[PDB]
């Protein structure tokens, strides 16, 4: 077995294959640099209820994803125990918090933040999950600017965070302990694996978990595996002024174009703050000025003014694998022995133990986890929303980038922008395809891409229609 990719997904499936099949040789590819790597840039939140949006829970496909995230949560305590068991005290703790506080402030669009807070509250009630709406004065540690302060707060019990760096170290250690072999090179081509040093590695099973590069690698063998783009994410490590940190995750609901504000606790007087999100049609390995300023401005005003005078340790950049139809690519292929584990966008890390168990069950002739069949990697592009829903959503999210800044402008201007944004986005959607509509996150990226890149997408969408219809 060859696993292509050394993120959380690759290493998680690697650990589970090595542990449950001691007969077979499992080799895992990928370099220590982890170029464009989502996992090392992640806090990371074990996001289930925190990830709930009104928009997600209005589509069948969105309610399934949520259900899987709830299932994944139950696996984490034993998964961590089994990964820490292969190490010692000095390797550090994977878990950094047990609980999450969701904050509602007015530094955003009412159409996102008010709707999403209500949807989180609802989803917690439906699932009988332990939680309570608490007084904002009872949230520990936070010291917001009064004009940016929360007026409502939601304590979610058993929704926590891991140190993504200690998790990766623990996965590598646990992989080696179970007989896995780490070969620090990149796959160049799947033969039905040729590595970038010129060598060839034979195998009867290849699992592609190469993050945002996963589809580009399998497509060479193009219109049957949905494209994966780079959801470029910026986060930061900060040494706090006094070495303190909050006891819980602190977060807002998901915001304009799947951005969001959160602070994940870390050991040793550090905190993680994140995270920006921009779908890019080509990969990008560096934060923009705008991304850095926006992340820092939100954290200092909405969470703790003490972060203003705190020391910047590191600006982190990773690529969320962003699937063109908005849903993951998990499981089997029309090619025997070819598996794919990618397109997890915001929550691959959270779902990793469940997704790893699913793919291993499939590889052993099982059915794995029930709800994951819809997310077969070899599929027609899913249409989880009407064109109408997506056009309302993309205009709302565009307006939200203003309210999240937050801007100050004449009161006539937001009404002007609302009406003048509708036409151009409606025109783009109609021009792109008669059948497929890109989700909002990707549609804004396409709107502000070159004409050549738009035309290439029109060809792609047309070639996919001919293949499947």
- Positions at the binding site for FAD: 6, 9, 35, 38-39, 45, 186-187, 344-346, 348-350
Helix residue ranges, H only, 92-206: 110-126, 164-177
Of 316, 233, 325, nearest to 280 (Cα)? 233
Compute the distance between CA of residue 360 and CA of residue 368 in angstroms, rounded to an integer.
8
CB of 462 to a second copy, least distance (A): 18
Give the CB-nearest residue to ligand FAD: 7
Q: Which is nearer to a second copy, 114 or 374 (CB)?
A: 374
Q: How far apart are CA 166 and CA 375, in angstroms?
A: 29
Residue 331 binding partner per list ligand I55, a second copy, ligand FAD, none, with a CB distance cut-off of 5 to 8 Å that depends on partner kind: none
Q: Which residues pair with 55 in a beta bridge?
A: none
Taking the C-alpha atoms of 182, 183, 187 and 191 in order, what is their torsion angle to the nearest 10 degrees?
-90
Strand partners, 97: 161
In angstroms, the CA 21 to CA 2 distance is 13
Q: Determine the Cα–Cα distance for residues 348 and 261; give it in Å rounded to an integer.
A: 18
Sites for ligand FAD among residues 334-363 (CB under 6 A): 342, 344-350
Q: Is 318 in the site for ligand FAD (CB under 6 A)?
A: yes
Using CA atoms, how far apart are residues 91 and 167, in angstroms rounded to an integer?
10
Regarding 371 and contact with a second copy (CB under 8 A), the answer is yes
* Residue 192 Cβ vs a second copy, minimum distance, rounded to whole Å: 11
Rounded least distance, CB 402 to ligand I55, Å? 7
- Report 301-340 residues binding a second copy (CB under 8 A): 334, 336
The residue within the footprint of ligand I55, chosen from 17, 107, 212, 256 (CB under 6 A), is: 256
Q: How far apart are CA 384 and CA 372, in angstroms?
A: 15
Whether a cis peptide bond, with omega within 30° of 0, leads into 275 is yes
**Residues forming the annotated binding site?**
6, 9, 35, 38-39, 45, 186-187, 344-346, 348-350
Q: Is residue 47 a contact point for ligand FAD (CB under 6 A)?
A: yes
E-state strands within 94-227: 95-97, 100-104, 131-134, 152-156, 161-162, 181-183, 187-189, 194-195, 206-208
Tokens representing residue 331 in the block: 């499981």
- Interaction between residue 224 and a second copy (CB under 8 A): yes
What does DSSP assign to residue 22?
A: T
Q: How many residues bind ligand I55 (CB under 6 A)?
A: 15
Residue number with CB closer to ligand FAD (368 or 428)? 368
- Given a second copy, ligand I55, ligand FAD, none, residue 401, with its beta carbon under 5 to 8 Å by kind, binds ligand I55
Residue 284 in contact with a second copy, rule: CB under 8 A: no
- Using CB under 6 A, which of the segments 128-136, 203-211, 292-300, 434-442 binds ligand FAD? 203-211
309 touches, from ligand I55, ligand FAD, a second copy, none (C-beta below 5 to 8 Å by class): ligand I55
Note whether 210 binds ligand FAD by CB under 6 A.
yes
- Binding residues for a second copy restricted to 79-108, rule: CB under 8 A: none
- Pick one of ligand I55, ligand FAD, a second copy, none as the site partner of residue 344 (Cβ within 5 to 8 A by kind): ligand FAD
Q: What is the spatial distance between Cα 313 and Cα 160, in angstroms, rounded to a whole number? A: 23
For 325-360, b where at least 16 C-beta lie within 10 A, e where not — what string? bbbbbbbbbeeebbbbbbbbbbbbbbbbbbbbbbbb
Cα separation of 227 and 224, whole Å?
Answer: 9
Closer residue to ligand I55, CB minimum distance, 183 or 346: 346
Positions in 16-75 near a second copy (CB under 8 A): 60, 64, 71, 74
Which region, judged by CB under 6 A, interacts with ligand I55, from 92-100, 163-171, 329-337, 443-451? 443-451
Chain residues that interact with ligand FAD, rule: CB under 6 A: 4-10, 29-30, 34-39, 41-45, 47, 186-187, 209-211, 213, 217, 233, 235, 274-275, 318-321, 342, 344-350
Chain residues that interact with ligand I55, rule: CB under 6 A: 256-257, 259, 277-278, 280, 288, 290-291, 309, 398, 401, 444-445, 448
């Amino acid at each position: 077995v060859i696993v292509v990719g050394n993120g959380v997904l690759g290493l998680s499936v690697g650990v589970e294959i090595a542990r449950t099949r001691p007969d077979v040789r499992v080799t895992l590819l990928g370099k220590p640099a982890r170029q464009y790597g989502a996992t090392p840039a992640a806090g990371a939140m074990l996001g289930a209820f925190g990830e709930v949006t009104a928009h997600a829970l209005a589509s069948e496909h969105g309610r399934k994803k949520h259900a899987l995230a709830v299932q994944a949560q139950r696996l984490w305590p034993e998964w961590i125990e089994s990964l820490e068991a292969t190490g010692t005290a000095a390797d550090g703790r994977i878990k950094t918090a047990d609980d999450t506080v969701v904050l509602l402030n007015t530094v955003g669009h009412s159409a996102l933040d008010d709707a999403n807070f209500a949807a989180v509250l609802t989803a917690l009630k439906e699932a009988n999950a332990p939680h309570e709406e608490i007084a904002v004065e009872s949230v520990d540690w936070i010291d917001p600017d009064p004009n940016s302060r929360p007026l409502r707060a939601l304590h979610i019990e058993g929704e926590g965070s891991v140190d993504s760096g200690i998790l990766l170290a623990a996965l590598e250690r646990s992989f080696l302990q179970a007989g896995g072999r780490l070969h620090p090179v990149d796959a160049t081509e799947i033969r039905a694996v040729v590595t970038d040093d010129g060598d060839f590695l034979p195998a009867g099973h290849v699992v592609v978990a190469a993050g945002a590069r996963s589809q580009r690698l399998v497509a060479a063998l193009a219109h049957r595996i949905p494209r994966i783009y780079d959801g470029v994410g910026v986060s930061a490590l900060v040494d706090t002024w006094d070495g303190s940190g909050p006891a819980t995750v602190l977060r807002t609901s998901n915001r304009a174009f799947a951005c969001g504000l959160h602070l994940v606790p870390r050991a040793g007087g550090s905190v993680y703050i994140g995270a920006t999100n921009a779908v890019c049609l080509e990969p990008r390995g560096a934060a923009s000025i705008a991304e850095t300023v926006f992340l820092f401005n939100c954290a200092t005003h909405q969470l703790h003014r003490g972060l203003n005078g705190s020391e910047l340790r590191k600006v982190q950049v990773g690529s969320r694998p962003a699937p063109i139809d908005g849903f993951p690519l998990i499981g089997g292929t029309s090619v025997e022995g070819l598996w794919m584990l990618s397109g997890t966008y915001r929550d691959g890390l959270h779902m990793s133990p469940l997704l790893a168990r699913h793919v291993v069950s499939l590889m052993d002739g099982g059915t794995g986890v029930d709800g994951l069949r819809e997310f077969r990697p070899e599929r027609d592009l899913i249409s989880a929303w009407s064109r109408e829903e997506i056009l309302d959503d993309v205009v709302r999210h565009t307006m939200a980038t203003g309210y999240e800044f937050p801007w100050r402008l004449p009161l006539e201007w937001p009404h002007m922008m609302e009406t003048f944004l509708q036409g151009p986005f409606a025109e783009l959607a109609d021009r792109l395809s008669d059948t497929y509509t890109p989700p909002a996150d990707l549609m804004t990226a396409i709107m502000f891409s070159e004409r050549e890149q738009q035309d290439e997408l029109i060809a792609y969408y047309a070639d996919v229609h001919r293949e499947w219809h």
